[PDB]
């Protein structure tokens, strides 16, 4: 042309996991080119692990995927961020939402070209099962196909009933999306709803929403231009350790919750309720259990819930 | 004539296995043969694990490797066993027998199919994507000589119409010109199904591989398109019979409508030399022949009491006895949510249902309960829909806006492989005799709101376009979830002003349930604590009086009853209707409200397992109607 | 000759219909019209077809129904009861009544 990790790999994974600050190192590794924007990288690093997934008989399956929406001024670097997270994840798809078929992300019964026969072809959400699916140009996605994502983010299954075939597939994926506003700037005075041109439920169901802002600041502008030119000037980042660590954490590790998380979580939610919907607490639990999967552990404690609440309240600050 | 020695050993070993296994001494296979004798069945089932312990696999591996050559001896031994132990199964009203193997140790994928397993016994898995008609296949042919009129019978056929050659008992010389006696010949059922690879076995970028599986005998129609099924049988190879000299001129030497691949022109290795072929070249392709198929992806009281076991029957009748049972049932519905007992009661009444009646004049009276639940966001309105769709049989889930062309009622589409107009199925159609759970009910299209004007009341869909005219059937109950207009409920405006539905549609909903959350320091603590008791203990967090199976059995048993109305119940009903009409003042209250009250009374009576209706039930139904208006 | 598809009501929701061929002899021609829904009593037969054996690859046979009786059911919901081929036709005593 053009898995089965060894014991030495296990040992090096353990000793690296024994690092004092594993959070910041892979915070900076995922996007070496991106300068600042450390908080969105924190969120993406937490997303790439995901909270534990469970399906008990009585209540049913409870989701364990984290959804993130990036939006803001039109000339930031969100697309490069998405193309960065595309490569790290094991199984994922990077397709823009500008056009294509209304079921282009799900199954589409099509006539076979080579033979006059019938073939069932899955879409991009089914093909990102168990991973992270990146959507680009979220604002151009059509009103009729949007509803498809609605059943994906709610029941995590897609049903097709055409040409005598009635069946259901499995989505179980995570949505990271990037959007653009109407106009050349996101004026803070007007609220989010008018600018982003997205239905309130669709924006609401996203676990984390980040606003990227671009203000004319002499310090920030000079610092950005400096490192950009330094990159153009010709003169702590692991290469593939991330993929193996991600696979190890996703395929073997399953954390649990203890009463130490109970005590902090209940009072934190109540204090946030001193307009936080019940979605907020299930968002904190997922983020805390995903942080617990990092700094390799088998149970949650105070540090994970503190980091989760800090992240979800810094999200509120914007 | 030359005979085989290994085949004889396999034949006697199979007879010994059938006669001697007896391990449970029960004579399990003799029990099966007795069951076939009493029930008049034509197929036997043999487990591989059962055979995997006799002779240390010497018989099992011999059968597996050369199933194709050993099947005739297995059937011959089965014939002797049947004759010895049950002669009645030797003749029909002879039964062509079938042997079904299952529980093989390892399963294969479609991409492991190589020519070196041709003739072997295998098991495969795949998703069905097409099925054909049940056609009759010619099994044992019978002919008559044109001149002698002599009768030949039992002329085996492999892959093409085969007539006999040398004439029967006289002097007559004849090589051809026979006449099939279609009446004397034996036939069998035949079906062809197309399968493809599963969603997980498909690589990251792949065009799915396909296969042709042949179902024969009693295995027809057991695989339906879209399902995931595990087949087991023998891998065979099928030649091209067209160039094998078919009798008729209809084949016309491979008439074609499309162009064959130039890439494989001369690359596909065809064998020549045979006299039947002539100068032609014979070609082969791999197909599968299946003998066993498995899938891996009545309101009559007397017949109902027969199926259940004695322990279940006693448990059910002890369950019925207690008078608190009703209060327990409303607690068993959706044990994974906090609060909203009225919603649970409404859902239970919907699932129990009402009686359907037909008048002598031919007009049908509705017996389906429709519920609408509204409220501000984050009130667990979408958890009830998931519970219902998971627990209620023949139930479907859908949203307001639909991507499909047949969004919610129906659409007319031309045939993909025919010359006619067909009809696709909407969510309402796919829920006949079931519950349809509609979410985001506000954003429906007007052409669908006008369309549902017939399904809710007349329970039919009637279309008339260029292609087809039909009167479809939608006898489905509707559970709808909606949000108030403007984002939040206002506690001084009515249901009408806050909602957007018109009076036609609003009057067709039996029950309205408005659920409201409140921001106070104490209830939020309880809700958060309850929701977080999960995720540590997945099973011990919730404890209902009855499990899912007991409730599912009780609902089915209760639906057998059909209550009637007493003398005082009618007077109480008319009095309550008159009072409600007086209180309304005719803008919101119509005859449909009285009919809905009758339906609710009948459902509440079905809840208590009583065949007579008491005015207390009408009072309860009246209170339920008043609570939503 | 006519082709009978399965009625949409009879077909399970979401499945493809099936069709069969019916031969109408003298006195039965032009009774049924394209678009109507009909009930036919007849004889189910089999015949040998070369193309069917050539394409499928097995000695399968074609089937066809020779029609004996025709009853119209277009718009009729009273099919639950009543006896005969046409319930809108009268006898002599009925005309006298
Ligand atoms: N914070 C940043 N760090 C590095 N490069 C940046 C940054 N912001 C903008 N850029 C530059 O601007 C361009 C952004 O393009 P991109 O973000 O892909 O388009 P879009 O706005 O459609 O997402 C990139 O070529 C990148 O080099
Ligand atoms: N007992 C409960 N009371 C209130 N809310 C709950 C309860 N249990 C779960 N929830 C929350 O309600 C959500 C269910 O979605 P829901 O609010 O019905 O969506 P929508 O209101 O958009 O239909 C879940 O995400 C869960 O976090
Ligand atoms: Zn002869």
Question: Key features?
Answer:
part of a larger assembly; 3 chains; A: 318 residues; alpha/beta; 5-stranded parallel sheet; two-stranded antiparallel ribbon; B: 629 residues; mini-chromosome maintenance (MCM) complex, chain A, domain 1; OB fold (Dihydrolipoamide Acetyltransferase, E2P); 5-stranded mixed barrel; 19 helices; 23 strands; binds adenosine-5'-diphosphate; binds zinc ion; DNA replication licensing factor MCM4 (chain A); single-stranded DNA helicase activity (chain B); nucleotide-binding (chain B); DNA replication (chain B)
Give an overview of the whole structure.
- This is part of a larger assembly, with chains A (318 residues), B (629 residues) and C (97 residues).
- Chain A is built from twelve helices and eleven strands.
- The longest helix of chain A has 16 residues, at 278-293.
- In chain A, strands 4-7-10-3-11 form a five-stranded parallel sheet, with helices on one face.
- Chain A is an alpha/beta fold and 318 residues long.
- With 629 residues, chain B is of the alpha/beta class.
- Chain B folds into four domains: 2-87 and 94-106, mini-chromosome maintenance (MCM) complex, chain A, domain 1, CATH 3.30.1640.10; 107-135 and 189-240 and 283-297, Nucleic acid-binding proteins (OB fold (Dihydrolipoamide Acetyltransferase, E2P)), CATH 2.40.50; 136-188, no CATH class; 310-629, Rossmann fold, CATH 3.40.50.
- Chain B contains 19 helices and 23 strands.
- In chain B, strand 18 and strand 19 form a beta hairpin.
- The longest helix of chain B is centred in the N-terminal third of the chain and has 19 residues, at 67-85.
- The radius of gyration of chain B is 33 Å and the shape is elongated.
- With 97 residues, chain C is an alpha+beta fold.
- Chain C is built from two helices and four strands.
- Chain C has helices spanning 50-56, 92-96; strands at 2-5, 19-23, 38-47, 62-72.
- Chain C has a four-stranded mixed sheet, with no helix packed on it.
- Classes of the chains: A alpha/beta (318), B alpha/beta (629), C alpha+beta (97).
- The interface between A and B is large, with 60 and 53 residues.
- The complex binds adenosine-5'-diphosphate (2 copies) and zinc ion.
- One adenosine-5'-diphosphate sits between chains B (337-338, 377-383, 481, 527, 530-531) and A (278-279, 282).
- Chain A: Residues 22-229 form the MCM domain.
- Chain A: It is found in: Nucleus.
- Chain A: A motif (Arginine finger) lies at residues 204-207.
- Chain A: ATP binds at residues 72-79.
